């Protein structure tokens, strides 16, 4: 059985930790909602 619990407000936070790259990828989306890489 599934239940929900509040975890916070939705707000932008100044000086949050900045990380992650920005890859440009060729992808395909199948009928089951699964993404796959196209090469």
């Amino acid at each position: 059985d599934m239940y929900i619990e509040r975890a916070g407000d939705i707000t932008w936070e100044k000086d949050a930790e900045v990380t992650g790259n920005s890859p440009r990828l060729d992808v395909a989306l199948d009928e089951s909602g699964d993404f796959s890489l196209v090469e």
Binding site: M2, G8, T11, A16, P23, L25, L29, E31
Partner: protein, 156 residues
């Protein structure tokens, strides 16, 4: 149950202990999450019940109590924040510049941030705090890292 706007954990007691299977957004009395988190099942909020209202396996999205309300979009230029809600850990904002998923049906923003699967449903925000999509449906790249689409629904 609780109907206040904000980010929520999605939990289950079916397995060992209490397990976080995902996250979701409550906005305008409607709870939004990814379809693979709940598989369209009903949810409980205290004593109250949330019934699914709309869902789509291909978009991998579902809304409870009403129609999908989130309609803000990534501008294609600016940095965004993932409001990550990891299992057993406090909600935390992470800023990143999205990449792009290029598809035969158009381009979609993508965030290259790697978190446990139970973080799926965490909202991605623009600089005004608007939810431009949810984290958790994506792909695994050459190096083994995870890249999620910025998945957004349509507000009818």
């Amino acid at each position: 149950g609780e109907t206040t706007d904000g980010v929520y954990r999605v939990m289950t007691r079916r397995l060992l202990g209490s397990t976080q299977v995902g996250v979701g957004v409550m906005q305008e009395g409607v709870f939004h999450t990814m379809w693979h988190v709940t598989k369209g099942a009903a949810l409980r909020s205290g004593e109250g019940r949330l019934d699914p209202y709309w869902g789509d396996v291909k978009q991998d999205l579902v809304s409870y109590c009403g129609p999908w309300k989130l309609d803000a979009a990534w501008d294609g230029l600016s940095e965004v924040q993932l409001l990550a809600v990891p299992p057993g850990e406090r909600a935390k904002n992470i800023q990143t510049l999205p990449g792009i998923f290029k598809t035969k049906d158009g381009d979609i923003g993508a965030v290259a941030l790697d978190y446990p699967a139970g973080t799926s449903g965490s909202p991605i925000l623009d600089k005004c705090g608007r939810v431009i999509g949810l984290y958790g449906n994506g792909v695994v790249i050459k190096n083994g890292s995870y890249v999620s689409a910025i998945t957004q629904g349509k507000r009818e």
